[PDB]
């Protein structure tokens, strides 16, 4: 039908006029196919015949028989509407329901009126055998199939229609997603079917037809990759193929599927499968699976061995979010309300820092979950974390960055998190003092890194291809090698200081990793900074001999 | 009745900013606030033919029990400037900042009176979100001057002046400044006297639609970079000492670091103070507590503010337009890093407003995500400053202790 709902005022963009692209003659049968389809729609009210007034026309054509109307120009020329693409509810946020049923709207778009003042711009022509004969002029009376604004005005139309019913039935839940309506409630099979008939009828009062009980449709539901039961949810069924040869495209899809599963499957890892990708290559290139990868796929297959389902949200309970350190830079979490009935799983390996440690990673993960928890449940979860509340304050307080974790508490699930070394807050007595320094010729890209000591010692190991910066980490590194269990170091590089002063426990930097490894071996390390190019007995000294030649 | 034809900038287009995900309780709060507002016709439902959007938050009155809706017109403001600034700009009185006491009155409740130019209402579109996106989400637009929009005060001046006129004439020494939803009124009167004059003012406003903030700008002093007094310096002590002396060097023309310098060496080793030593810092001390030489406010170049976390509820901050030529630098001290930083910002912003009549853009030493999550949870002010996230250069934090 065509809904008696009021129309949405539409407009073209400020400095533009309707579309006027000429019609490109079609084949005999396509002509025939169109004339048929157009007469049918015409009787239904979907379209109308217009006088040679409308200077507007947009190309039309047919494909095997249905009618496709290209609206590129009308589109580009139309306007912008309130985004329809905003956010997809997550199943884990859903309240449990007793009866669930799904109704789809037939010819949704064609069921909804188009602003009268705008109908003229949709005018299109049915070509004669070639040209050489006027041609049947048509304009739309309802939301055309590929025109922007349809997805939006429809959703608007549907809402305002659904309004009253919702008002008269607050306990009932209705979710609109495209041609579909999902309807849930806490009623028993009979009495819910009644309420749905009360809905279908209501919906028909407004021009929307739906399938009858006969050809309805029952749970589970397959929505956006999920499988939705009224009492539980999971991700859509998924089979990891058994193969000898894996193409990049094969492993691509695999990594994708795994990630999607980790939404509810705990323990999923893809690190070893992602490495296999690192590096430019064609999607047809076969890649032999490294040993870790071969095993990763093993377990992954194991935790997927048996179906697993997430529970739905009970508003009257707290959310318990739990986090575990699995491997390096890898973090997994679970969210439940009753010890171990998960609502959703998840993993986290994102760490945009060039250099970083566990306590920051852990806090970052917590932040992600926090925000993820906000949109899903609208409240914040209680956290259980593998970090001593003391080994967190220490960090919290000394760090230069502002933090804040929601209510959390220690949970003892190794590996636990901790600082793998602490820098001294004051100098060390009877500790060799190392004035380190770096240098490098901008042209030539070569340089030298060394140090001098209050005990007379001196070194100057030369390096090959490195930046002015690297001749600074290399030196502070040097000082670490030849020094005792307990030494203080002076630099003029706020760079190195910065990197080292934030207690990194890992880095995407060969050198930094070694320094860390060394930092962990010591017992007391104190690092200090002086301004370069002053008269500092030491820095100047190491500068003299580090900058002698090649600088 | 008479609506002021608001016209967006030439070329620029309406705001299209996503609504930040809100907690259940703020939503409930907002749905109530908004049902009331449209009931009283201040806002209207709107169709999908309106593509614009501005984020909206819920804040609690003045740390009380009553919720207040807060719109983020940052973006709309940036695209309306010419109008609110060059068009109907409000002049900033230098006198304000010298007064003994400044009170801050929220007078935004007055804009709802004046109607908004129908042709401009569409850009004030905003959205109330829903949990897990289970319901589409309620879209409104304003039919009347909205609170957080620099366009309002600009448009409301004719009325505000009319209103304040009588009071101003009877109190020609009292200074009154308007800045987004707030009145800043300051006098050199004694506390009680001042407070009476505020009430006496409050009754004037009351006739056009309803001790706010006790502020003493004349008592605001510079946080001088401080040099230790010690008693027996070590290589380390003196080393760090010239460290910041060098930093200050880059500001405060005249700072001298040498003498100290000439003074290989062990780190723990103590060292005697040189006759040429005292001479130095002594004089470096003299300067530093004095105001910068050569630095001045440039009314056309907006203010940038940094804040470092000195730990222990301590926070240092500077305000400047060109890095290191700073107009001002101070300090600030269930409390958490984010709670305190949110206060530090409001504090810094308020002073800024009193002094220059504009907010600074903040370099917040936090994680965007973290800040965006929590900032609203402690925020109270009716305006929002431009911010930005960064990493406190280790040494900086120290040179401002
Ligand atoms: O938001 C939705 C979505 C999203 C995707 C699919 C179905 C539904 C739905 O019914 N709603 C309305 C709320 O449904 C609620 S609260 N609970 C449900 C809904 C649907 C099902 Cl199958 C189980 C549990």
UniProtKB/Swiss-Prot annotation, chain A:
Changing residue 161 to V: 70% loss of DNA-directed DNA polymerase activity. 64% loss of RNA-directed DNA polymerase activity. Changing residue 229 to A: Complete loss of RNA-dependent DNA polymerase activity. Complete loss of RNA 5'-end and 3'-end cleavages. Changing residue 260 to T: Complete loss of polymerase activity. 87% loss of RNase H activity. Changing residue 495 to W: Almost no effect on RNAase H activity and replication. 6-fold resistance to inhibition by BBNH. Changing residue 434 to I: Loss of cleavage between p51 RT and p15. Changing residue 177 to A: Almost complete loss of polymerase activity. Coiled coil: none annotated. Mg(2+) 1 binds at residues 104, 179-180. Changing residue 183 to I: 25% increase of DNA-directed DNA polymerase activity. No loss of RNA-directed DNA polymerase activity. Changing residue 533 to D: Severely reduced exonuclease activity of RNase H, but no effect on endonucleonuclease activity. Changing residue 436 to K: Almost complete loss of virion production. Changing residue 221 to A: No effect on RNA-dependent DNA polymerase activity. Complete loss of RNA 5'-end cleavage. No effect on RNA 3'-end cleavage. Changing residue 400 to L: Decreased RT p66/p51 heterodimerization. The record marks 434-435 as: Cleavage. Changing residue 227 to A: Complete loss of RNA-dependent DNA polymerase activity. Complete loss of RNA 5'-end and 3'-end cleavages. The record marks 395, 408 as: Essential for RT p66/p51 heterodimerization. Changing residue 472 to Q: No loss of polymerase activity. complete loss of RNase H activity. Changing residue 533 to N: Severely reduced exonuclease activity of RNase H, but no effect on endonucleonuclease activity. This is Reverse transcriptase/ribonuclease H. The lineage of its organism: Viruses, Riboviria, Pararnavirae, Artverviricota, Revtraviricetes.
